[PDB]
């Protein structure tokens, strides 16, 4: 009966966002409501507290990738020569195209749990100057706590 635990039921890696960059940039505001197979299981609880593990996979077709996390309440990049990319406050990871990176954002919220809520945003660029890269981000909820079971949505 370990598969009925909420870390087993909700805490598994699914593909939350898929984008494509060129050699310019793409920013995704983090919202786990975009994937209807994870939202259908998560919206049967009112409040939920969980840390996170993002595993980013980059694949090319016809190089370095700068996947930068942006904390809640901080501006997103608007171009591919912006100052947000060079900014020290916002974390970033530089990994080669074809393999995968992995990081782990802590529970970032204002209330003691998310109510299905500002998780932040991830911005993606390729650093080389003067090919189409497909980015797949897989999110895994960690140390989950749920608190009011709701009726499951039918429509």
């Amino acid at each position: 009966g370990s598969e009925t635990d909420v870390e087993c039921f909700l805490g598994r890696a699914a593909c939350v966002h898929v984008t494509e960059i060129q050699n310019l940039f793409n920013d995704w505001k983090i919202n786990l409501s975009s994937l209807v197979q994870l939202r259908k299981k998560l919206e049967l609880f009112t409040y939920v507290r969980f840390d996170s593990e993002y595993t980013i996979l980059a694949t090319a077709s016809q190089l370095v990738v700068q996947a930068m996390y942006v904390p809640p309440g901080a501006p997103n990049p608007k171009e591919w020569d912006d100052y947000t990319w060079q900014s020290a406050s916002n974390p970033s990871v530089f990994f080669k195209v074809g393999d995968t990176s992995r990081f782990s954002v802590p529970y970032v919220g204002l209330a003691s749990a998310y109510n299905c809520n500002h998780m932040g945003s991830m911005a993606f660029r390729i650093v080389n100057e003067h090919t189409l890269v497909k980015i797949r981000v897989y999110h895994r909820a960690k140390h989950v706590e749920a608190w009011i079971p709701r009726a499951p949505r039918a429509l």
Partner: protein
């Protein structure tokens, strides 16, 4: 025994009692819905404290009683939903099987005519600007209308210390 007195109020059933307007359960009515504390925004001293203080925190005890004889049929489902999604003291005159997951107490005229629900303060923050919604749904239709009375008692209520703080 059967005369719970709370503050300046007294009720007979089996911190003050606010009795909302009595609704008439006709055979074609779908039910009713009351968001809390919005149903008490115009309710005397509570409505004054709720408006005056920026933040607050309160629990509730809801007694729903349907005055009727021992000849009527049908059953109502009284359910309190925390954080319900898409009115005042007049309520909202209106899957369902799954609503039993939420705290509920079926009233069935055959056997019972009262339902009492003690609601604690449920929120993702310890204190908040003044959250839950009580619904009354007639499931089995009424066969012989019958009056429905809703009584809300806010209890264990605290409000913010600002506007009462000295700066010295």
């Amino acid at each position: 025994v059967q005369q719970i007195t709370l503050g300046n109020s007294t009720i007979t059933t089996q911190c003050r009692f606010y009795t909302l307007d009595s609704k008439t359960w006709t055979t074609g009515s779908k039910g009713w819905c009351w968001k809390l504390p919005d149903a008490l925004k115009d309710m005397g001293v509570f409505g004054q404290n709720m408006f005056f203080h920026s933040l607050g925190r309160s629990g509730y005890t809801v007694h729903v009683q349907c005055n009727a004889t021992k000849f009527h049929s049908g059953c109502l489902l009284v359910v309190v939903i925390p954080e319900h999604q898409l009115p005042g003291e007049r309520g909202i005159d209106l899957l369902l099987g799954n609503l039993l997951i939420f705290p509920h107490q079926f009233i069935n005229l055959r056997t019972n005519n009262t339902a009492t629900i003690v609601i604690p303060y449920i929120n993702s923050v310890p204190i908040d600007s003044m959250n839950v919604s009580l619904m009354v749904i007639p499931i089995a239709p009424l066969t012989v209308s019958l009056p429905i009375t809703v009584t809300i008692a806010p209890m264990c209520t605290e409000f913010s210390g600002i506007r009462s703080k000295s700066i010295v």
